DNA sequence: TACGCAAACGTTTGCGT
DNA sequence: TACGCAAACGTTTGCGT
């Protein structure tokens with residue numbers, strides 16, 4: 001069909017291609033005629049043919065974990081903006097943490113010959129790390145590791161530990177000493193990482209978290225709901241709670257309400273993520289904000305680089321969480337004594 | 339590189355291709371050898387070359403409006419599941435209701451030669467309807483119209499009007515007669531449509547909504563926040579409020595709380611969407627549930643059809659909203675008098 | 677029986693002159 | 694000066710025998 005254009009215009013397809021890609025000078029008259037044809041014939045140049053020759057699809061693949069989750073969703077929307085503005089096409093894939101699913105999308109991606117790969121898999125077992133390597137040839141950056149798990153990738157690091165520390169510190173500085181924590185999956189960075197940053201500040205303050213006070217979450221609201229319940233549903237209960245993620249926090253808020261508990265008047269709650277609509281939680285959620293937009297743009301850029309300026313070496317860029325005071329925390333019994 | 343495989347195996351590329359696509363019988367010995375090579379050589383068949391010949395990319399394009407929004411997000415995650423399970427690849431595009439952006443993604447999509455198009459643009463001006471037609475050749479279904487705006491597409495219809503009616507009815511049947519409403523954009527179906535279904539039930543009950551009681555939203559939480567405020571911030575206020583979408587409702591809940599109003603004890607609130615985590619709103623949100631999963635699977639199917647069984651005629655399938663009682667509504671002053 | 681030769685898909689780009 | 698011819702990208706598939 002580029003042939004059909006060339007002939008309506010009575011010029012070579014070489015000509016047609018040059019005017020289309022402005023790749024060499026062409027007589028106006030000529031140029032015009034081509035456009036003419038191009039339009040009446042209703043021509044849509046085929047990218048598949050082009051990619052076949054030029055060797056790049058100008059398309060990028062995001063191998064995510066899930067895209068419904070608030071947290072994830074915001075990131076993804078970020079990456080897409082960046083692809084759109086630099087002409088890239090985004091292929092979205094959710095692996096639900098399923099190896100098989102992961103092996104599958106990864107392969108459905110290489111064949112489609114994506115220019116680069118964006119990896120956000122939450123948990124990284126050696127078997128997954130292993131698969132990942134089999135595609136070192138395809139440029140890629142993992143956007144969710146704590147440290148640099150591997151050498152065949154680029155990495156953007158969130159400083160999830162420094163975030164945990166911040167959260168704890170805040171609680172301490174507000175007068176709290178009986179604190180509880182609902183962490184996210186330990187196999188994940190935003191999980192383990194945040195928790196440990198938190199425990200460190202405790203250790204520092206000689207606070208001790210009684211194990212009956214720490215309950216595993218899964219980032220889902222129901223997990224939060226169940227944990228808070230289990231926490232407040234006991235003889236002795238903390239006065240403040242650190243919840244590993246906002247959406248779980250949202251769940252924690254609902255249960256308290258349901259036990260007729262008052263936030264922050266009966267329990268103080270601090271979360272983590274600062275998801276777009278946490279300010280509209282009831283009450284407005286105090287939390288640690290994760291730079292989602294930057295986490296995305298930053299990732300897109302390292303990739304474009306490697307893609308364009310053919311980098312070979314592994315890079316890593318840090319990003320920084322920051323505390324956001326809203327209205328879900330209140331002074332604790334020791335506020336006056338410091 | 340299929341050539342490199344054929345030679346490590348000392349067979350024709352024709353052979354290689356046949357064993358790869360199991361498209362004709364091949365000697366085990368032969369088959370094996372090919373696999374052998376296939377593996378040592380680390381071969382990834384190129385889809386771009388294949389599509390070039392077979393004439394289909396086995397990839398579908400979703401021209402959405404935005405993907406962060408809860409509502410949208412859930413739908414999208416649904417479509418992707420369906421693509422994944424039937425071997426399709428999903429290209430996600432957000433046009434933010436921007437014509438230019440829409441013209442762009444639409445074109446960046448045809449060229450990439452997607453097998454079919456999934457359209458979810460919220461608002462459809464003639465200029466957009468017009469662009470859409472220019473691609474009638476590419477199979478596509480719009481998943482968000484009220485009626486069948488055009489004839490060159492397939493349509494899944496949500497019965498957003500019947501939903502509005504349901505909401506109103508409920509309020510009426512609970513004793514309410516002083517009701518207010520925060521609708522979504524009138525230029526959109528889930529906006530106009532829901533509102534009108536609602537007004538009809540009012541008209542039926544001879545209830546009259548004083549214009550000081552209806553405030554436009556935009557589906558975003560802040561819009562909700564502002565509207566509720568404007569509503570309760572007045573001499574005379576309704577006892578129940580119908581909010582066009584859950585996330586806006588979430589916003590409406592926060593403001594009431596902030597004016598020290600009690601839900602549902604001071605104001606009753608009913609929303610619409612039944613977004614995955616509305617049950618964890620405080621209080622648990624009573625709402626109209628939109629079948630998001632079905633809305634998605636249903637759309638994917640009409641498309642696959644047209645794509646596969648080469649349909650030519652426009653189809654339309656209806657889907658149905660249903661009421662979900664949670665805890666944000668309470669009996670009104672007229673409950674006892676019916 | 678089990679497999680090859682060679683043309684074709686729709687482009688881009690090197691040399692020409 | 695301003696433009697064409699023809700090979701190549703990596704496959705699939707019709708006929709062969």
Ligand code: HPA
Nearest residue numbers: 069071122190219245273
């Ligand atoms: O894995 C996660 N899921 C949801 N929210 C999150 N916030 C941090 N990590 C996550």
Ligand code: HPA
Nearest residue numbers: 407409460528557583611
């Ligand atoms: O356009 C919309 N946006 C967000 N939520 C919605 N629920 C119905 N329509 C919409």
